[PDB]
Structures are given as structure tokens and as C-alpha cells.
Design a protein around this nucleic acid. Structure first.
Ligand SMILES: [Zn+2]
Ligand SMILES: [Zn+2]
Length: 454
RNA sequence: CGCCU
């Protein structure tokens, strides 16, 4: 059920066939990168980083291994970026460093985030801004973009038409039926595509073991309002700097309860700056202020929105927990971790929670309140989605082995034949020839470490 | 299930 221990290098790609090679994101969540080959030309979908398991000096970021494309960088027609999360765009500066003029293709918000990051590397990319419904030809790859709801706005899936057929890549997605911006995962589009014929579907496996459905994001508002309604002093809320809709709900609550909001921490100030500037984050006049003014306000009128929900030791929340921040936690402070607890950050996160608790804060988190919902489709949604797409072949992506296997089982339950479901690992080469996907070889795909200079 | 600075 797993790829053969000694697959060799793949054979020549038959004329009229398509080659699909995940270089990252399989067997380990992160550094997502998938290479598509047709007629000697390459299309890359996503290029992320992976964060190490507690690894000390010498190791900051982990990259996909570019060895299999490095001697044919001139064949790359473009890099499609499904959405602006670091495990999908973090690797881009390191790829462009080897060939700077590879066009970036993505939504407005996605491009604003990757351009912000690139500016620090002194790199100005060529870009093609796309939106849902746009269809564009990139060399031999005919690309159509489809809206998907996720935990960051402006995420996209892509359908890639070649003479080998149509491949659909979901990116990361779920299916919130009441999204804050009204932007649904576009099931009409997926239905139409399925009637044309989806020959190969690559689908997000992150939440495939979780039965049932993701609760809508907007339900978090009720919990926030309760917490705000009952907080008598300062409120401090930590979230990922990219979760615009979560932060939106925080501002709405603050507004409702007569509080003002300051953003704290480099990432948060930067991203919320961009979201507000471009209109993804809706901010009423008078609500957001500079943190320096909060001293002059009564505690009961204060909300700090800050960074460090994963216990990152340099982020704001951890420094506050360790008495090493401008903001000093006092008895009666309310702290909300409006976030997931990513498997493996448990020790860091609990260390922060315990620190905060020691200084007398009331700490609200997903363990004692519903202040977070997953950004990825659950088993129930995946069944809906497969019943709509009816793919002729299925490749689960974006998951550890337990995730990929569970996703494959869901596919099988909806009627995808078992011989048309392929579970790949990083570096495994899959060929779509005459409508059928088969594993045909493997390339080098180990870990590559980087200190900013690699 | 994506950082943070
Ligand atoms: Zn992801
Ligand atoms: Zn994501």
C-alpha cells in the first residue's frame, strides 16, 4: 500500500502524458510543493517551508529539495500559489534566488503577502494576478482558477487542462457555508468540471480522520462575545497573523463592547496592515489604535491582538508569559488563544499557558472553549466534495500517512476504484497516461536546511 | 497543520 522501497528513476514521459511529482507535503505536513510536467515543460504548484521538530542552531527553515528541477530551471513556465500561508509560499524566495524571472501566479492577497516577504530578500518577481473564474494559458498548461474557502481569504484551487486530461489541485480548503466574506468554496464550478471530466484530483488530507463537519467560523463570535462580556480588565488575544476572519471577529467583539484595539508583534502589524489596506479586513473608524496609547486607557477598554499562539519563544505571548515584554501580565488579565494547537507545539504552548496562569491571567483556549475551528475539510465535507467531483483518479496530498490513508478510504467510499487511488510520498513520480494514474518512479526529495543562506 | 523575528 506504500511506494516500492526501490523505485528507480522514472522512465521517459510518454508523449501526450502528464507527470506529477510531489516534492513536499506528503508524509509530513509542510514545505508543500508539486511539480507538473507536460511536453518537457514544468508548472510548479506551491513552494512552502517546513518547520523543524525543536531543532537548535544551524537549522531554521526546511525546504523542498530542488535537485530534480535545478538543471532544468529554464523549463519552468510558472509557480502557482494557491494561498498565502508560509507552508505554501515560504520556499519561493529560495527558488527565485536560482532563477529570478519565474512568474508568480496567484490571488491579490496571496501576491501581496509573497511580495512583502520577497522585498526583504531584495527580489522583485514577475507576477500574474488571477481571481476565481480566470482562465489563463501558461505554456502548455491551461489553468482555470476556482474559489475555495479556507483559514486565510482569497485562497484558490486550480484546474490544469493539458492533452493528458484535466488535473484538479484543491490547495488547502474547507467548505464553510456561512463565510464572513460570503466567498464560498465554489461547488458549481467543481460540478461543471466534474461533468467535463476530472481525470486526476489532488486533495487536502489534513482533516480527513475527523468525522463529521467543521463548525462555521462565525460561531466563534458567540464565544468571543461571552468572554468579552464577562472580562472586567484587559483582554489579550493571540492568533496566527494571517487569520483575517478570526481577527475580524475579534474587532467586531471589541467594537460591540466599547473597547479599542492595538496590534502587537511584527507579523501581526504587517499582515493586518496589508489586509486592511486591501479591504479584506473591515475596520470601523476609531477602533484600532497604537499600542503606546493603551497605557492611558482604563484596562476595561483595552484589547491587544498579538502574535505567538504556538508558543514561539520570540513572539509576544511567550515574552509576556516570561516577564520579558513591554506588556506586563497582571492578575485579572484575560488571555485568549484563538488558535489551533499544532501537534508538536504542545510543550511550548502549555509552557506559555502555565506562565500566564502563574501571573494570574484567565486563559481561554481551544481546550476549554470553542475559540477555534479547523481551516481544512473534515471527513463529511470530503465525502460531499468527492461526490461532486467524481474524479477518475485520486491523489491525497498535504498529510502524514494516517491522513493520506484516511482520505484515500473516503475516496473509495464514494466509488473511486481502489486501483485509481494513489498514495505517494515526497519524490514519488506519478504518470497520467491514457486517463490512468500510476506510480512510475521516484526522484531525490530529502530535507534541505536553511539559515537564510542555505 | 502554520511560523516568528
Ligand atoms: Zn497548508
Ligand atoms: Zn493553509
Amino acid at each position: 500500500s506504500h511506494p516500492h522501497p526501490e523505485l528507480g528513476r522514472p522512465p521517459a514521459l510518454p508523449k501526450g502524458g502528464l507527470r506529477v511529482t510531489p516534492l513536499g507535503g506528503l508524509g509530513e505536513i509542510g514545505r508543500n510543493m508539486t511539480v507538473f510536467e507536460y511536453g518537457g515543460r514544468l508548472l510548479i504548484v506551491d513552494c512552502g517551508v517546513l518547520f523543524p521538530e525543536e531543532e537548535q542552531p544551524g537549522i531554521d527553515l526546511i525546504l523542498p529539495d530542488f535537485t530534480s528541477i535545478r538543471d532544468r530551471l529554464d523549463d519552468i513556465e510558472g509557480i502557482v500559489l494557491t494561498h498565502g500561508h508560509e507552508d505554501h509560499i515560504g520556499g519561493v524566495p529560495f527558488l527565485l534566488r536560482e532563477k529570478p524571472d519565474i512568474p508568480l501566479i496567484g490571488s491579490k492577497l496571496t501576491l501581496a503577502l509573497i511580495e512583502a516577504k520577497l522585498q526583504e530578500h531584495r527580489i522583485r518577481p514577475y507576477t500574474l494576478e488571477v481571481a476565481e473564474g480566470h482562465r489563463e494559458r501558461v505554456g502548455p498548461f491551461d489553468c482555470e482558477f476556482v474559489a475555495v474557502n479556507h483559514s486565510i481569504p482569497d485562497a484558490l484551487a486550480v484546474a490544469i487542462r493539458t492533452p493528458a486530461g484535466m488535473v484538479v489541485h484543491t490547495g488547502d480548503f474547507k467548505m464553510d457555508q456561512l463565510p464572513l466574506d460570503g466567498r464560498l468554496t465554489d461547488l458549481h464550478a467543481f460540478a461543471r468540471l466534474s461533468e467535463e471530466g476530472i481525470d486526476l484530483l489532488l486533495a487536502d488530507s489534513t482533516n480527513a480522520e475527523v468525522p463529521g463537519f467543521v463548525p462555521p467560523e462565525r460561531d466563534i463570535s458567540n464565544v468571543l462575545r461571552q468572554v468579552f462580556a464577562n472580562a472586567r480588565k484587559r483582554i489579550i488575544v493571540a492568533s496566527f497573523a494571517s487569520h483575517v476572519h478570526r481577527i475580524q471577529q475579534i474587532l467586531d467583539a471589541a467594537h460591540e463592547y466599547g473597547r479599542r484595539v492595538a496590534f502587537v508583534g511584527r507579523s501581526m502589524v504587517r499582515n493586518m496592515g496589508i489586509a486592511r489596506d486591501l479591504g479584506y479586513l473591515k475596520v470601523p473608524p476609531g477602533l484600532v489604535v497604537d499600542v503606546k496609547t493603551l497605557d492611558d486607557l482604563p484596562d476595561s477598554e483595552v484589547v491587544l491582538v498579538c502574535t505567538g499562539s504556538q508558543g514561539e519563544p520570540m513572539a509576544a505571548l511567550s515574552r509576556m508569559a516570561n516577564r520579558d515584554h513591554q506588556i506586563r501580565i497582571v492578575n485579572g488579565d484575560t488571555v485568549i488563544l484563538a488558535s489551533s494547537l499544532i501537534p508538536g507545539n504542545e510543550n511550548a504552548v502549555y509552557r506559555v499557558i502555565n506562565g500566564l496562569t502563574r501571573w494570574g491571567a484567565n486563559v481561554v483556549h481551544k481546550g476549554n472553549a470553542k475559540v477555534h475551528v479547523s481551516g481544512h475539510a473534515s471527513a463529511g465535507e470530503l465525502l460531499y466534495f468527492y461526490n461532486i467531483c467524481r474524479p477518475k483518479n485520486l491523489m491525497p496530498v498535504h498529510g502524514e500517512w494516517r491522513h493520506l490513508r484516511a482520505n484515500a478510504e473516503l475516496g473509495a467510499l464514494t466509488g473511486v476504484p481502489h486501483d485509481r487511488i494513489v498514495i505517494a510520498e515526497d519524490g514519488v513520480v506519478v504518470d497520467l497516461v491514457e486517463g490512468k494514474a500510476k506510480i512510475t518512479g521516484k526522484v531525490q526529495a530529502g530535507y534541505v536546511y536553511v539559515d537564510g543562506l542555505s
